[PDB]
């Protein structure tokens, strides 16, 4: 049922200011991942973003159609973020019901003007997703959830997609190393904060390319701590859980900086 | 024309408090709730009304910024604030006025003092639920102008000592901004206390028989601290703040509490408790430091 | 000289409140507790300190009498008040002074109004736990003299409506006694609100994470009533007192509330809420009706 | 194990002012019951008093020796009640632990200056019990306990006594009809308040004398309600439960007024 898999950046800087060459490349690479997405002919898109924060219990987006203009609470000077996002209401509501059976309290989320996070929006815009052709089943990033639980959450959704007989594209939205610069820089001279962050990204990115699930699995908890990886890399656990801890190789379409932070676009070879 | 910090309030922002009030701004209906904490905010409201200030300043934990300390800087901000965590209890159509001139002076003073600052000039900005809530609880009239200040990342990203230090400089710079501009200002620390909590949301939220402290130690920590506060032992709370953060998981880590007191200059003045109470197990105290009555309000 | 009821306090008596304050007089040691209700009492304490009353009058539910309404009648009473239900939290060494003259005047006036009244003349008498608690929570100095009144059976033995009438007559007689002696008095309705409660206390009774309202329906009755008290709509709270008693099982059934308000002539005045909290699931509110700050405290010309 | 059973008044008037003839008669009858008590050579006396009020859990007297001067809060004008009461701590503590094993939360009570109720005190004085020879196991009257619950509480104490090879005498302390005069009377003019109460008393007292347990069981809740009988007549339930619902007859040693309320001394023939 899972026919496609991707990891993309949840930073808005590539979409907002693609005139910066490195960010321009990140944007181009997320767009190229969109063609690869479409060509896989999915019915639903299993989306997880690191910026969709929940605390009480697991939240699933159940609102048929969400639209508006989002302003990033950090990057509001580089423009706005219009969005029009469709949801697979049947899958989402099923995910809500399937959730407490697997040991995770969940609730559907359907409210007018509910804030969809920057990550989900930028990946929709750039990848051309969340349209009526490719609706979403977005799961929140609960702060108290572990990568274990996140994997269980993604799996649970693939299995909910199986008995509705639907083709699934998986997208985990989030960054790599998270050493954000703490002063304002010239965006044209944005680079990766350290070389330690750079080497770590390069390394774990190479383990993704080779598809060494086992070496990746053990590098993950150390990498997450040592490179301040966006939310402990739970947006990769999402992709692993969706593929039930198994994938061949992978393809890296882009890797650059986002204000000292590491960002990358990865197409997964199933 | 000389500046004044009339008073600083500890003014927590659980959205259930506005949910309990059933105002026109908030969409969902309640059957009441958290009346103890609301009655605390009754005494806050009238203490404020008898001050007649030019501006309310508020430092909110729910506008988190990575690069510096941001300031609201648009004359009129409007919108619909739906809380991403509690959208069932909080969906609020806000319409506020910003003291842009003072916001800019705080930003310039912060910049001058070694901090990185930015003015939020985007007219479509969605104001966080902590800012919207604290303000509506202390002044539902929506008339006094406001400066919304973001909570910089530093206490979480660097560590507590460095974060607090940054937050202290911000306080001192805020004082300077008030005095250079001759504003009559009230400070609002939008902070809750013990945040260690349970994950159980009652079927009907307002059910007050389901409301209680999450841990005994949480409550005890909250009591020891606010008891030191109403004692006027300010130095001693700030000596205990690191340990209070670590063990009670208190939201004063976000920084508003340090910011407010630094701006008042850590006055050894006893505070007045309008009430303690818990929301979803969290410790919430509504307090005030009356600087005018203590005669330390002139800058 | 003119008689005066300075103010009327609603002053709940759950012994856990003194337990948590660790005064010299109480024997058992606590690790704090119920500080919201205890701070609520801090304000009440300071409001009364600035009244310097001649006398405090308290009507306690925990001195139950069948043969009319009794009044403390010995100048000095002392002892060790141990609470029969929570002796683990309350074992208090008390020593107080009784305004015998006014107590006798209350009996006198109550008798003339058609009530049967008795003077308590036995010096070996041990004051009830409820009286000792309300008095300490409002006045830990034990410096103002007191008049302690029993709670007559009436509302339980006969019925609520009929018993409530006796408490009213008693209140009117109390006012009349104050005015004739020319005393500057503070009245203490030693009453709890919703009293549904749970019959099980935890390992550490002070454990505040285990303290909460017993029923949602109970807490709601309380709020509604203390809101109406805040709004100053008194006539409305008394029209509701019967249903409040039936549904919330309120301790106002004992009559201290009606005695107090009857003595204050049911003023349509706003009441100040110092705080609300639960003790053993039980609803408690510390409140005040400032009659001076309203100019309704003066009663008339004194006798002799 | 159970060698004796008695019902005695909880009113202090008979011991306080026996110069009032009727009152003097009730005191002399309680004294006679005390002698019948001692003649049955018990080791412990199991006591229940209507005036020992409990709200939370069941309380049992576990203090080896309680002494003081008790002053009744209704009848303080008639004098003081000095006391020196001994508890069978070994048996009392057994009752404490055994009570939840029959579905009743319970605590021991052992506090200096803990107020023994008027009923327990007056019974001890007149009956010559609560001494080191006839120590007490006193169980509280919990307001929320029914008669059924009270019997199970008494049977359980009788159980614990068999486990310790102890001869039990059983004393239920309390009044009969309870329509106390609501104004001051001349104590010499004391009489049962009304005729309906007098009839009810005589009727059930006759059922007790005869030994008709069945008839007595059916009449009890009607009698309790109609004649406002002291605390639902649970003090008789106490005796019944100790006797396992069985007894042969009864001798009514005295029946008289107590400020309008009714009161009797009853010796039960096992
Ligand atoms: O219960 N809530 O909704 C809360 C409680 C404490 C907080 O600091 C908050 O932001 C929300
Ligand atoms: O908790 N207690 O101990 C209480 C609570 C309410 C009362 O009215 C009381 O007499 C005692
Ligand atoms: Fe918060
Ligand atoms: Fe009480």
Q: Could you tell me which of B241, B65, B259, B249 has the C-alpha nearest to residue B153?
A: B65
Tell me, rounded to whole angstroms, the distance of Cα A265 from its chain centroid: 10
DSSP label of C113: T
CA–CA distance, B104 with B55 (Å, rounded to integer): 13
| Radius of gyration of chain C from its Cα atoms, rounded to whole angstroms | 18
Q: Cβ(B190) to ligand 1 under 6 A?
A: no
CA–CA distance, D221 with D237 (Å, rounded to integer): 11
Experimental method: X-ray
Token duo for residue B241: 């703040």
CA atoms within 13 A on the CB side of A145: 31
Token duo for residue A257: 């900086």
Instruction: Identify the chains in contact with A, defined as 3+ C-beta pairs within 8 A.
Output: B
Stated as kind and residue range, the H or E segment containing C17 is helix C16-19
Stated as kind and residue range, the H or E segment containing C192 is none
SS3 category, A103? coil
Strands (E), D122-190: 136-142, 168-173
Stated as kind and residue range, the H or E segment containing C87 is none
Q: Do chains A and D touch (3 or more CB pairs under 8 A)?
A: no
SS3 category, C46? helix
Residues 6+ apart with CB under 8 A from C28: C19, C88, C89, C90, C91
Using the mean position of ligand 3's atoms as its centre, give its distance from the Cα of residue B251 in Å.
Answer: 7
* Whether A6 contacts chain B with CB within 8 A: no
User: With an 8 Å Cβ cutoff, are A182 and B116 in contact?
Assistant: yes
Tell me, rounded to whole angstroms, the distance of Cα D160 from its chain centroid: 20
Q: Could you tell me which of D176, D78, D87 has the C-alpha nearest to residue D124?
A: D87
Residues 6+ apart with CB under 8 A from B62: B13, B128, B129, B130, B131, B151
CB-CB: which of D80, D105, D180 is closest to C66? Answer: D180
Torsion from C-alpha of A50, A52, A57, A59, nearest 10 degrees = -120
Residue of B nearest to C204 (CA): B216
CA–CA distance, C258 with C262 (Å, rounded to integer): 6
User: Using an 8 Å Cβ cutoff, are C258 and C171 in contact?
Assistant: yes
Q: Number of Cβ pairs closer than 8 Å across A and B?
A: 76
Q: Which CATH number fits domain B1-299: 3.30.70.1020, 3.90.1150.10, 3.40.830.10, 3.30.930.10?
A: 3.40.830.10
Indicate which atom in ligand 2 lies nearest the CA of residue C129: 10
CA–CA distance, B131 with B141 (Å, rounded to integer): 15
User: Which residues 200-239 of B are in CB contact (within 8 Å) with C?
Assistant: 207-216, 218-220, 223, 227
Indicate which atom in ligand 2 lies nearest the CA of residue C15: 3
For chain B, the residue count is: 299
Q: Which residue has a Cα nearest atom 4 of ligand 2?
A: C14
Residue with tokens 């898109």, as numbered in its chain: A45
For chain D, the residue count is: 270
- CATH number for the domain whose boundaries are C1-304: 3.40.830.10
Tell me, rounded to whole angstroms, the distance of Cα B6 from its chain centroid: 16
CB-CB: which of C85, C122, C126 is closest to D55? Answer: C85
Q: Could you tell me which of B220, B204, B197, B221 has the C-alpha nearest to residue B279?
A: B197
Q: Do chains A and B touch (3 or more CB pairs under 8 A)?
A: yes
SS3 category, D83? strand
SS3 category, A102? helix
Spell out the alpha helix ranges (H) of chain A: 13-16, 21-39, 89-98, 118-127, 147-162, 196-210, 213-226, 234-242
User: For the residues of C134-169, what is the DSSP string, one character each?
Assistant: HHHHH-TT--S-EEEEEEESHHHHT-HHHHHHHHHH
- What residues of chain B lie within 8 A of the CB of A182, using their CB? 66-68, 116, 153-154, 157
Residues 6+ apart with CB under 8 A from C263: C5, C8, C171, C172, C174, C175, C178, C187
Using the mean position of ligand 4's atoms as its centre, give its distance from the Cα of residue C65 in Å.
Answer: 15
Residue of C nearest to D76 (CA): C122
Residue with tokens 């007050």, as numbered in its chain: B208
CA–CA distance, C74 with D76 (Å, rounded to integer): 13
How is chain D split among helix, strand and coil, in percent rounded to 5? 40, 25, 35
Stated as kind and residue range, the H or E segment containing C194 is none
- What residues of chain C lie within 8 A of the CB of B221, using their CB? none
Q: Number of Cβ pairs closer than 8 Å across B and C?
A: 54
Spell out the alpha helix ranges (H) of D79-146: 89-98, 118-127
CA–CA distance, A239 with B37 (Å, rounded to integer): 44
Q: Could you tell me which of D52, C13, D180, A73 has the C-alpha nearest to residue B128?
A: A73
CB-CB: which of B66, B91, B128 is closest to A111? Answer: B91
User: Using an 8 Å Cβ cutoff, are B126 and A71 in contact?
Assistant: yes
Q: Cβ(B192) to ligand 1 under 6 A?
A: yes
CB-CB: which of C39, C213, C223 is closest to B273? Answer: C39
CB-CB: which of C36, C219, C227 is closest to B208? Answer: C219
CA–CA distance, A21 with A14 (Å, rounded to integer): 9
User: Using an 8 Å Cβ cutoff, are B91 and B81 in contact?
Assistant: yes
CA distance D87 to chain C (A): 17
User: With an 8 Å Cβ cutoff, are C209 and B207 in contact?
Assistant: no
User: For the residues of chain B, what is the DSSP string, one character each?
Assistant: ---EEEEEEE----THHHHHH--SSB-S--S---HHHHHHHHHHHHHHHTT--SEEEEEEEEEEESSSEEEE--SEEEEEEE-SS-TTT-EEEEEEEB-HHHHHHHHHHHHHTT--EEEE--TT----HHHHHHHHHH-TT--S-EEEEEEESHHHHT-HHHHHHHHHHHHHHHHHHHHHHT-EEEEEE---S---------SSTT-GGG---S-HHHHHHHHHHHHHHTTT-HHHHHHHHHHHHHHH--GGGSSHHHHHHHHHT---PPPEEEEEEEETTEEEEEEEEEHHHHT--B-
Q: What domains does chain A contain, in order, with CATH numbers?
A: 1-270 (3.40.830.10)
- What residues of chain B lie within 8 A of the CB of C211, using their CB? 212
CA–CA distance, B77 with B72 (Å, rounded to integer): 9
SS3 category, D64? coil
Ligand at minimal distance from the CA of B192 is 1
Q: Cβ(C279) to ligand 2 under 6 A?
A: yes
DSSP label of D163: T
* Whether A226 contacts chain B with CB within 8 A: no
Q: Could you tell me which of B71, B63, B118, B74 has the C-alpha nearest to residue B96?
A: B74
Residues 6+ apart with CB under 8 A from B275: B36, B37, B39, B40, B43, B285, B286, C36, C275
Ligand at minimal distance from the CA of B197 is 1
* Whether A82 contacts chain B with CB within 8 A: no
User: Using an 8 Å Cβ cutoff, are D253 and D29 in contact?
Assistant: yes
Q: Cβ(B16) to ligand 1 under 6 A?
A: yes
Angle in degrees, CA C154, D119, D36, rounded to 5: 140
User: Using an 8 Å Cβ cutoff, are B103 and B71 in contact?
Assistant: yes
C59 is in an annotated binding site: no
CA–CA distance, D220 with D225 (Å, rounded to integer): 9
The phi and psi torsions of B73 (rounded to 5 degrees) equal: -145, 45
Q: Could you tell me which of C40, C24, C20 has the C-alpha nearest to residue C208?
A: C20
Using the mean position of ligand 4's atoms as its centre, give its distance from the Cα of residue A254 in Å.
Answer: 73
The phi and psi torsions of C287 (rounded to 5 degrees) equal: -140, 160
Token duo for residue D222: 């009607």
* Whether C270 contacts chain B with CB within 8 A: no
Phi/psi region, residue D231 (left: phi>0; alpha: psi -120 to 50; beta: rest), is: left
- What residues of chain A lie within 8 A of the CB of B118, using their CB? 77, 184
Q: Could you tell me which of C127, C118, C163 has the C-alpha nearest to residue C256?
A: C163
Neighbours of C65 (CB within 10 A): 18
User: Using an 8 Å Cβ cutoff, are B57 and B186 in contact?
Assistant: yes
Residues 6+ apart with CB under 8 A from C74: C98, C100, C120, C121, C122, C123, C125
Residues 6+ apart with CB under 8 A from A148: A237
CA–CA distance, A232 with D179 (Å, rounded to integer): 76
Indicate which atom in ligand 1 lies nearest the CA of residue B83: 3
For residue C36, CA distances in Å to C58, C140, D160, D247 come to 23, 18, 45, 56
Residue of C nearest to D185 (CA): C67
Neighbours of D268 (CB within 10 A): 23
Token duo for residue C115: 């009530």
Neighbours of B164 (CB within 10 A): 23
Angle in degrees, CA B22, B27, B32, rounded to 5: 25
CA–CA distance, A234 with A244 (Å, rounded to integer): 14
Domain boundaries, chain B: 1-299
Token duo for residue C167: 């408490």
User: With an 8 Å Cβ cutoff, are A180 and B67 in contact?
Assistant: yes
CA–CA distance, A206 with B212 (Å, rounded to integer): 50
């Amino acid at each position: 049922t899972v026919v496609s898999a991707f990891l993309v950046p949840g930073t808005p800087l590539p979409q907002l200011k693609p005139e910066v060459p490195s960010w321009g490349q990140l944007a181009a690479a997320t767009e190229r991942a969109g063609k690869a997405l479409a060509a896989s002919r999915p019915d639903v898109v299993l989306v997880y973003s690191t910026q969709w924060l929940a605390v009480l219990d697991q939240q699933w987006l159940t609102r048929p159609r969400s639209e508006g203009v989002h302003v990033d609470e950090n990057w509001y000077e580089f423009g706005d973020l219009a969005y029009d996002i469709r949801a697979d209401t049947a899958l989402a509501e099923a995910c809500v019901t399937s959730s407490p059976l697997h040991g995770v309290h969940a609730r559907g989320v359907n409210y007018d003007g509910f804030p969809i996070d920057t990550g989900t929006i930028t990946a929709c815009t750039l990848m051309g997703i969340g349209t009526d052709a490719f609706p979403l089943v977005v799961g929140s990033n609960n702060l108290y959830h572990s990568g274990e639980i996140t994997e269980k959450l993604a799996a649970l959704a693939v299995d909910c997609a199986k008995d509705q007989n639907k083709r699934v594209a998986v997208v985990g939205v989030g960054g790599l190393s998270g050493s954000l610069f703490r002063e304002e820089i010239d965006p044209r001279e944005d680079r990766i904060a350290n070389e330690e962050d750079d080497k770590w990204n390069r390394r774990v990115l190479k383990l993704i390319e080779a598809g060494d699930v086992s070496a990746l699995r053990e590098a993950m908890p150390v990498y997450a701590k040592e490179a301040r990886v966006d939310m402990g890399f739970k947006h990769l656990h999402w992709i692993l859980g969706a593929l039930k801890g198994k994938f061949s190789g992978a393809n890296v379409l882009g890797y650059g900086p986002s204000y000292g932070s590491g960002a990358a676009v990865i197409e997964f070879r199933l | 024309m000389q500046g004044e910090i009339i008073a600083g309030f500890l003014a927590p922002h659980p959205p259930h408090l506005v949910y309990g009030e059933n105002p026109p701004q908030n969409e969902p209906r309640s059957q009441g709730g958290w009346e103890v904490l609301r009655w605390a905010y009754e005494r806050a409201r009238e203490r404020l009304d008898a001050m007649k200030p030019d501006v309310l300043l508020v430092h909110s934990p729910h506008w988190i910024t990575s690069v510096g300390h941001h300031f609201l800087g648009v004359p009129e901000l409007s919108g619909k604030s739906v809380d991403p965590i509690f959208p069932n209890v909080f969906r609020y159509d806000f319409s506020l006025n910003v003291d842009v001139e003072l916001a800019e002076a705080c930003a310039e003073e912060g910049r001058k003092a070694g901090l990185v600052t930015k003015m939020m000039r985007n007219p479509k900005f969605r104001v966080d639920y902590g800012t919207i809530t604290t303000l509506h609880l202390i002044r539902p009239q929506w008339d006094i102008p406001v400066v919304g200040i973001s909570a910089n990342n530093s206490p979480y990203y660097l560590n507590t000592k460095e974060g607090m230090s940054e937050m202290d400089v911000l306080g001192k710079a805020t004082r300077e901004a008030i005095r250079k501009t001759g504003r009559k200002a009230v400070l609002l620390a939008s902070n809750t206390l013990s945040h260690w909590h349970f994950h159980e949301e009652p079927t009907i939220p307002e059910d007050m028989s389901k409301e209680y402290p999450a841990t005994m130690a949480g409550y005890q920590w909250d009591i020891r601290m606010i008891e030191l506060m109403r004692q006027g032992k300010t130095s001693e709370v700030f000596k205990l703040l690191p340990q209070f953060i670590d063990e009670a998981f208190a939201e004063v880590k976000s920084g508003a509490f340090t910011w407010m007191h630094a701006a008042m200059q850590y006055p050894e003045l006893a505070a007045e408790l309008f009430g303690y109470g818990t929301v979803i197990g969290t410790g919430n105290a509504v307090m005030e430091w009356d600087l005018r009555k203590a005669g330390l309000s002139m800058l």
